[PDB]
Design a binder for this molecule. Structure first.
Ligand SMILES: *[C@@H]1O[C@H](CO)[C@@H](O[C@@H]2O[C@H](CO)[C@@H](O[C@@H]3O[C@H](CO[C@H]4O[C@H](CO)[C@@H](O)[C@H](O[C@H]5O[C@H](CO)[C@@H](O)[C@H](O)[C@@H]5O)[C@@H]4O)[C@@H](O)[C@H](O[C@H]4O[C@H](CO)[C@@H](O)[C@H](O)[C@@H]4O)[C@@H]3O)[C@H](O)[C@H]2NC(C)=O)[C@H](O)[C@H]1NC(C)=O
Ligand SMILES: *[C@@H]1O[C@H](CO)[C@@H](O[C@@H]2O[C@H](CO)[C@@H](O[C@@H]3O[C@H](CO[C@H]4O[C@H](CO)[C@@H](O)[C@H](O[C@H]5O[C@H](CO)[C@@H](O)[C@H](O)[C@@H]5O)[C@@H]4O)[C@@H](O)[C@H](O[C@H]4O[C@H](CO)[C@@H](O)[C@H](O)[C@@H]4O)[C@@H]3O)[C@H](O)[C@H]2NC(C)=O)[C@H](O)[C@H]1NC(C)=O
Ligand SMILES: CCCCCCCC(=O)OC[C@H](COP(=O)(O)O[C@@H]1[C@H](O)[C@H](O)[C@@H](OP(=O)(O)O)[C@H](OP(=O)(O)O)[C@H]1O)OC(=O)CCCCCCC
Ligand SMILES: CCCCCCCC(=O)OC[C@H](COP(=O)(O)O[C@@H]1[C@H](O)[C@H](O)[C@@H](OP(=O)(O)O)[C@H](OP(=O)(O)O)[C@H]1O)OC(=O)CCCCCCC
Lengths: 121, 330, 343, 336, 344, 334
């Protein structure tokens, strides 16, 4: 049973680094990605990285958040930089082979559980 | 000494202009030493051939008067002297050898005669008329002419020793055997003009002994396998059926393998008529017991085993008298 | 700055189209070969791959110098601006000069004009193999190289050392599956041609095929098929569907194993020593069913022997076949494996 | 005889700019095509391609290459084609192609004293024609070759076939082992890409597959295996190890015929119409084996409960050759 | 003569060894792709072939001119004299830049220096495949390109149009046997290599394998061999040689189908969805032969029922059960198998 | 801004000799290497090689290319690499290799103001491996890439991996279908020849073969065909046609398993671990058919001069002996 167990911060004013350790399946050939869901039920793409170390970013986040995978430890790491208070949401860790994908949430058939990242002003 | 001679021959020499461009056609004497005739690809209708090609032609622009009397040179002068555009007309793949240096060669005498030889392997083309397979014979041609220069500009001609054949024992002729050698001179008429085409014909018979021990020996000895059933008891209906229908199964296996060695032609070869009639005698053996089991048990016929023990070895051996005489000898 | 002015003086008035000592002497090219990997011998194509460092040294009088260095190592740009002997392989089919990441060549000039020119080649040479003793056969695959344009009276090839010590193979780069590289034998020769007489350096690599693949793939399935057909002599004589299935199947298997054994070999039109083995092993298989056709012609009863009327005997020719047919197959294996394990 | 010819050829190449077509600022140039086919080497259904070896010629005029005083059509060495403008014609179907280079690169330049220049190539190409194998091996394909310029639009270059019926010669002298060339067509048209409108010539060959290979290798063994499945109706129903062993051997053979005919063919997701036949002949084999189990269940399972065993055999001896004759009647009149 | 000195003036003070604005600003190179034939997708090498008209547009300041022509449609030799961006393919294995009959490259120069440079390419690119649902799987095959030597601070790639309309696949040029191109997705990314950050353009071709060939050659022989092995339940129990020849041979048939259908695939370690079907269909054929061994163990006689009727063998309860059970359980398994994987 | 940069590069190569090693009489030049591996395409046991695609990069310092005033790193076109000195590094394992040429020849020249120059190549090479397949398919392999200079000895050139053990990257990203890269090593050593002592670097992988392909295709039917040869011990001795036909069919299936697996594998002269198993299961298959001929000879041949006890014995013994055979086999090679 594949468990994308997440970790990282959940209370921040300051940078942050949300991590996602995988278990049960090697995701080297797969694509591991980061998502955002605000209160309002909107899964939003944040970042993704291909097997060939190619970083795909969303339009509102291109330049702020940096993705970095570790192919030996089978993990993906989102580096949170310049956290505006509008980024207070639940960050999900996805891992898929993207079919009609890399921006569509329905192309990732393995999921994290979520992390309430709260930015307080 | 010789550096003075070589730079004088190239002083004002234009390698794009044919010698005697407005006088007469350039007579070129060709020679060919066939090193090896490689694997005759029956499926692709190719054959690989390794030949050393040599050409002599007079060139008045390369005359000198000195004591050196011959200029024996590398391939470095070939790119500075007019070389004929000889192409192999039926070559599917042809490669010159470039290891270690370019394997080209150039002599220049003092009267202007230029010798030029190079090493070439040619995956040439010959349409194998595979009637009477594998008992046939072919004459696979090797043809060459000039490419851009017509009959009015370059005329080829054979020397005294036209094609010199090597040892013939170090060749990769497996199913074939070099029996003859024939040359000709013809003039084709394409759209560009009349071209003098040299042609060398390699007569190749068959070393037949491969397909004997691969199709003929398995097909005969399995026709004899069906003949075992006639000496086996009449009321052994599981054994006689297993003799019949399983012998058909390995006839279908042998029929596929014989067609695999030859290309996918549509007509019937001498290989095909043998395998199909050997399939008929295996087909007829099971139908013989089907009539014998039905007429006797399920209701002459009671001696039809005794008739089939004599007639079916007779009909197969009389078929071999028709087959092996008329396809080999006549 | 200094060595730039040296190398320009070597190429002023130099002619890379003329032989060193053109009218004076005969060029003496000393050769050497370091075989890195005697690669896989192709049986169907009758070739063999060999990966070498072909080394050839000669003396050019025009390339003398006096400078700070005795032997200046060079990039191989200048190897194309200097006469190199046109050595070609007499039996090479389609060989490769490696060009990764540069042309793998080196030109070294000494101050007396002696040139050292080596190059890494992958020679796919032609080895004529007589496969009459297949697979217990030995071969001698040749490398023949000489000049192409220059005759005996103009260039002479030699070996740099004693000749048997020149062609040296690596101790770990074998790269062979079926063959034992049992050393080599070098020899010099002269090949007369319609254009002249040329000096030819020959090198015969003596090979011997390892038997152990064809034993476990052809000989052991064929021997255990002949034994399988001879299982049927220890049955009764009335089980006609039982002994027929032994008879027909072992003919099918020996038909299948005869076809599968030619496929590791080119299509030469004669009988190899493996083909003589299968043809005799097919004879012991096919005679076992002719034995059963003889027994079933003599059975005279349809019912077998009950454990408790007259019954049927144990078919006295079956007792002779139990003795003779494992014996004559055992005698044939003594004749076969002692004749062909000597050639 | 030679000195005057050298002066005129070196005058034409002096100041000649090969980066400019003839009439670079003016009208488009006409380039006429002329193809002489050597042979069609192989037409592989697996790779969906065909190999074409042909002599490929191009006439156009060039007023920069006009000379006087020489009545001869000057045939030059092929190295002058590196010093002349030649059209950048490409083949859209082309997978892999090469100009032959023995003993020289097979080019020709034949200048004419009015500016016309012949450029002739000897090209072996491997062009890609996709095949609809829903009627295999009773089908007809066609395969095209799309001659088109690359860098020059229809406002810079024009193509035509020289003698638009007799431009391509040597088609009737092509021997193909599986195929019979019915006809060939020459189409001159224009295509429009995003960059511009380009001139295109297409050479197409409607190939008809000869079927003599497949009767003797696929059909006639499939016929005679299916007829030998019918021998177990003239065998008594008590022979359980005979009628079963005949049918079980017969369902093996139709399986092993399918194994060779999936190896030699590409992986296409439909019934190739030789599989309309082989799956159909597999049914006549499989229903002959279901016939004995219908016999074996009635005599031994519905037997003591008291419906004619001999009548079922006598029915199948008439129906199954009659139904297999109607199967070949529908099959060989639909696909032929 | 007029147009020659225009081109010679452009090449006087021009250096093709350095980027336009090497010390001033970045170089935007707008890219366009016209896919002609999306060629055959090799399963065993895990790759795919694609033929394109790879188009590149960028502004070069040094190639400004004023002449009669507004645009210069020039030869491909001048393209080897002008700075061309070193675009390579991040997943190309062995790709061909065509040059029949001339190098298939066009160079068009407008009068403000905006260059148009297209070239015809056959690309054999790598496609990572996840064959856990073979043959009923679908996967995306990327086509990823960027600059080789020039980083984000030097050369930035863009698309000429909206990226959904910047890669156009031709209609007639399909050139696919098994798969079915459902559409493409165009995106753009950034690498972190050991030499810097490179702008990477990306096209994802979304394929779905048609299962028509793999039903015919594998599934229908595997289904009908299970249908074979259940016919011997309807034969009588006294035909001991007839059912033994019947049962073991269908095991040999399923053995042949197992090793032959595995060959038409890569050598991955996991079990594909076809291999789940062959293993269970082998188990129905395996259990049908063990069913007869239980029938043979309780036969208790050796002779069968003559038609005129001594005591005889009743039709066994385990045979009358397996006439009902084993055809039903194979039909239930096909409802489980074909609804699990076609729903994905 | 831009024309000064052209003027700088035009006089770096003014009087540049590409035939001279840097400091041609002085110290040897130090060439540092850095490999970014894209993929490993195929690992062939028949051809005894592997295909490696990599970003092969070389740093060295050349004082003749030192510029001043320009603060940036001169990223030049790939055609200037034909006008510089580059090392002649080769591979001894190299069967057939090529630098990629689409859309250009994938070279890079990145000059630095102190004279340091990067020369990067994208190389797909086919390097050879002689494989020890005596434990096939339960084995570990060792494939090596042997980088070495060709014409410059250790007094002319020196090699070192740049970054220590973090020189070769991209190894963790490689997902092979039937192998598993356990460990890679970086070895630097000098290799002597008759011409001189040349420096050599060595990238070397450890390939542990995944076995799930052969459990599906080779081991599981060879178990189950051997088990179905044991049905004849639950069949009476009177059924001669039944017990022979399942014994004939099980020696046919082990033949067809062996013939389908000899077409896959090369011409190895030894006996593999899978050949020990297929010939091992063939014994238990062939002894099951010799067993009936032992039974048939006792009852019907030596009749008038037990039959149930031999079958009842072998119902337990042959499953026990074959399960003992797998216990010896799967603990030796694993
Ligand atoms: C193999 O299979 C392929 C594909 O099926 C076949 O290829 C097609 O062949 C047909 C002929 O059999 C081609 O059609 C012809 O095209 C010409 C082109 O003429 C051009 O120039 C004209 C001016 O001179 C111009 O008017 C034309 O424009 C028209 O046509 C285009 C399409 O080509 C269309 O878009 C426009 O709207 C116009 O309608 C064009 O630029 C055309 O002249 C032919 O028309 C004549 O013949 C038809 C009868 O065939 C007749 O009805 C007309 O009145 C006229 O007399 C004709 O349309 C077609 O272009 C080929 N398609 C492709 C993709 O190549 C091939 O033939 C097969 N080979 C074999 C051996 O079977
Ligand atoms: C696959 O197969 C390959 C090939 O066989 C294996 O590669 C081998 O790996 C081992 C372990 O890494 C290598 O051994 C090491 O070699 C280095 C290099 O030594 C060279 O350079 C030294 C200076 O840097 C120099 O001193 C050395 O000279 C000595 O060694 C030679 C050896 O012949 C000897 O003749 C001399 O007299 C000197 O004694 C030499 O020029 C060396 O530095 C290593 O030593 C270190 O590590 C050991 C422990 O391993 C430690 O005890 C030492 O103190 C020191 O720290 C070590 O000897 C070997 O060279 C490789 N083989 C080849 C042919 O290159 C590979 O391991 C296999 N598996 C895998 C997964 O790849
Ligand atoms: C390839 C083999 C070819 C064999 C060709 C053999 C051709 C040939 O002539 O065979 C005859 C005979 C076969 O004898 P075999 O034992 O098979 O048959 C018995 C024989 O016929 C007795 O005469 C019968 O008894 P009876 O008195 O009539 O009541 C007896 O009847 P029954 O017991 O059923 O009631 C039969 O079973 O062979 C020999 O005697 C030794 C030959 C050794 C040949 C050794 C050859 C290796
Ligand atoms: C895969 C199938 C595995 C079956 C394993 C079964 C293991 C097991 O224990 O079988 C024993 C028995 C087999 O009975 P089966 O019908 O085969 O055999 C009859 C039975 O022995 C009667 O008792 C005999 O009559 P009787 O003595 O004179 O009264 C009769 O003799 P006759 O008519 O010749 O005179 C025999 O034919 O099974 C069941 O009863 C149902 C079990 C259902 C089990 C269902 C498991 C799924």
């Amino acid at each position: 049973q594949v468990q994308l167990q997440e970790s990282g911060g959940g209370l921040v004013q300051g940078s942050l680094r949300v991590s996602c350790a995988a278990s049960g399946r090697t995701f080297t050939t797969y694509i591991m990605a980061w998502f955002r869901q605000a209160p309002g039920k909107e899964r939003e793409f944040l970042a993704a990285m291909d097997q060939g170390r190619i970083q795909y970013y969303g339009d509102s986040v291109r330049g702020r958040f940096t993705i970095s995978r570790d192919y030996a430890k089978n993990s993906v790491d989102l580096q949170l930089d310049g956290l505006r208070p509008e980024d207070t949401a639940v960050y999900y860790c996805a891992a898929g082979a993207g079919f009609w994908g890399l921006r569509t949430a329905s192309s990732y058939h393995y999921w994290g559980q979520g992390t309430q990242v709260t930015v307080s002003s | 000494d010789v550096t003075v001679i070589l730079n004088n021959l190239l002083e004002g020499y234009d390698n794009k202009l044919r010698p005697d461009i407005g006088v007469k056609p350039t007579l070129i004497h060709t020679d060919m030493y066939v090193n090896s005739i490689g694997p005759v690809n029956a499926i692709n209708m190719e054959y690989t051939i390794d030949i050393f090609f040599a050409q002599t032609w007079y060139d008045r622009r390369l005359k000198f008067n000195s004591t050196i009397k011959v200029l024996r040179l590398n391939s470095n002068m070939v790119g500075k002297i007019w070389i004929p555009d000889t192409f192999f007309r039926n070559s599917k793949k042809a490669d010159a050898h470039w290891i270690t240096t370019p394997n080209r060669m150039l002599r220049i005498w003092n009267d202007g005669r230029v010798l030029y030889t190079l090493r070439l392997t040619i995956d040439a083309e010959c349409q194998l008329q595979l009637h009477n397979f594998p008992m046939d014979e072919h004459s696979c041609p090797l043809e060459f002419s000039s490419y851009g220069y017509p009959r009015e500009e370059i005329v080829y001609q054979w020397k005294r020793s036209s094609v010199e054949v090597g040892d013939t024992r170090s060749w990769r002729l497996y199913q074939f055997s070099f029996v003859g050698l024939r040359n000709t001179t013809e003039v084709v008429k394409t759209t560009s003009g009349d071209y003098v085409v040299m042609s060398v014909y390699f007569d190749l018979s068959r070393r037949m002994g491969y397909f004997t021990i691969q199709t003929y020996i398995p097909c005969t000895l399995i026709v004899v396998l069906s003949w075992v059933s006639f000496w086996i008891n009449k009321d052994a209906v599981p054994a006689r059926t297993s003799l019949g229908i399983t012998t058909v199964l390995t006839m279908t296996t042998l029929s596929t393998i014989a067609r695999k060695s030859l290309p996918k032609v549509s007509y019937v070869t001498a290989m095909d008529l043998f395998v199909s009639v050997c399939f008929i005698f295996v087909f007829s053996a099971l139908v013989e017991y089907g009539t014998l089991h039905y007429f006797v048990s399920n209701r002459r016929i009671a001696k039809m085993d005794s008739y089939a023990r004599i007639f079916f070895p007779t009909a197969f051996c009389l078929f071999n008298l028709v087959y092996w005489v008329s396809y080999l000898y006549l | 700055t200094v060595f730039t002015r040296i190398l320009d003086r070597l190429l002023d008035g130099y002619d890379n189209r003329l032989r060193p000592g053109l009218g004076e002497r005969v060029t003496e090219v000393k050769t050497d070969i370091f075989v890195t990997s005697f690669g896989p011998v192709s049986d169907h194509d009758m070739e063999y791959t060999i990966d070498v460092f072909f080394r050839q040294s000669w003396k050019d009088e025009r390339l003398k110098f006096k400078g700070p260095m005795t032997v200046l190592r060079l990039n191989n740009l200048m190897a194309s601006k200097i006469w190199t002997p046109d050595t070609f392989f007499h039996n090479g089919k389609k060989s490769v000069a490696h060009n990764m990441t540069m042309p793998n060549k080196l030109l070294r000039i000494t101050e007396d004009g002696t040139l050292l020119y080596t190059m890494r080649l992958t020679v796919r040479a032609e080895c004529p193999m007589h496969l009459e003793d297949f697979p217990m056969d030995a071969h001698a695959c040749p490398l023949k190289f000489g000049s192409y344009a220059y005759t005996r009276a103009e260039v002479v090839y030699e070996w740099t050392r004693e000749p048997a010590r020149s062609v040296v193979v690596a101790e770990d780069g074998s790269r062979l599956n079926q063959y034992d590289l049992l050393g080599q034998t070098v020899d010099s020769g002269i090949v007369q041609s319609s254009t002249g007489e040329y000096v030819v350096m020959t090198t015969h690599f003596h090979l011997k095929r390892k038997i152990g693949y064809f034993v476990i793939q052809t000989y052991l399935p064929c021997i255990m098929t002949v034994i399988l057909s001879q299982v049927s002599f220890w049955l009764n004589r009335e089980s006609v569907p039982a002994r027929t299935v032994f008879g027909v199947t072992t003919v099918l298997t020996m038909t299948t194993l005869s076809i599968s054994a030619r496929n590791s070999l080119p299509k030469v039109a004669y009988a190899t020593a493996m083909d003589w083995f299968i043809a005799v092993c097919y004879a012991f298989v096919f005679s076992a069913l002719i034995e059963f056709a003889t027994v079933n012609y003599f059975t005279k009863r349809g019912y077998a022997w009950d454990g408790k009327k007259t019954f049927n005997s144990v078919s006295k020719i079956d007792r002779l076949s139990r003795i003779a047919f494992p014996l004559l197959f055992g005698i044939f294996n003594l004749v076969y494996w002692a004749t062909y394990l000597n050639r | 005889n030679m000195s005057f010819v050298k002066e005129t050829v070196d005058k034409l190449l002096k100041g000649y700019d090969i980066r400019l077509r003839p009439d670079f600022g003016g009208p488009p140039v006409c380039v006429g095509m002329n193809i002489d086919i050597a042979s069609i080497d192989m037409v592989s259904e697996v790779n969906m391609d065909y190999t074409l070896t042909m002599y490929f010629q191009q006439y156009w005029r060039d007023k920069r290459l006009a000379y006087s005083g020489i009545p001869l059509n000057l045939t030059l060495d092929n190295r002058v084609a590196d010093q002349l403008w030649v059209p950048d014609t490409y083949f859209l179907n082309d997978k892999k192609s090469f100009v032959h280079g023995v003993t020289v690169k097979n080019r020709m330049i034949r200048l004419h004293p009015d500016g016309t220049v012949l450029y002739g190539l000897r090209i072996t190409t491997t062009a890609a024609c996709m095949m609809d194998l829903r009627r295999y091996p009773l089908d007809e394909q066609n395969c095209t070759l799309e001659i088109e310029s690359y860098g020059y639009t229809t406002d810079d270059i024009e193509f035509y076939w020289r003698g638009g019926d007799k431009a391509v010669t040597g088609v009737e002298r092509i021997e193909l082992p599986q195929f019979s060339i019915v006809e060939h067509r020459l189409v001159s048209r224009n295509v429009v890409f995003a960059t511009g409108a380009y001139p295109r010539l297409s050479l197409s060959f409607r190939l008809k597959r000869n079927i003599g290979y497949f009767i003797l290798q696929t059909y006639m063994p499939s016929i005679l295996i299916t007829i030998l499945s019918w021998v177990s109706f003239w065998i008594n129903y008590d022979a359980s190890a005979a009628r079963v062993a005949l049918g079980i051997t017969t369902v093996l053979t139709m399986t092993t015929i399918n194994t060779h005919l999936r190896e030699t063919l590409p992986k296409i997701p439909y019934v190739k119409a030789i599989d309309m036949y082989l799956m159909g002949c597999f049914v006549f084999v499989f229903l002959a084996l279901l016939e004995y189990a219908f016999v074996n269940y009635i005599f031994f399972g519905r037997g003591p409960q008291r419906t004619d065993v001999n009548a079922i055999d006598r029915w199948s001896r008439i129906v199954f050759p009659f139904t297999f004759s109607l199967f070949n009647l529908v099959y060989w009149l639909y696909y032929v």
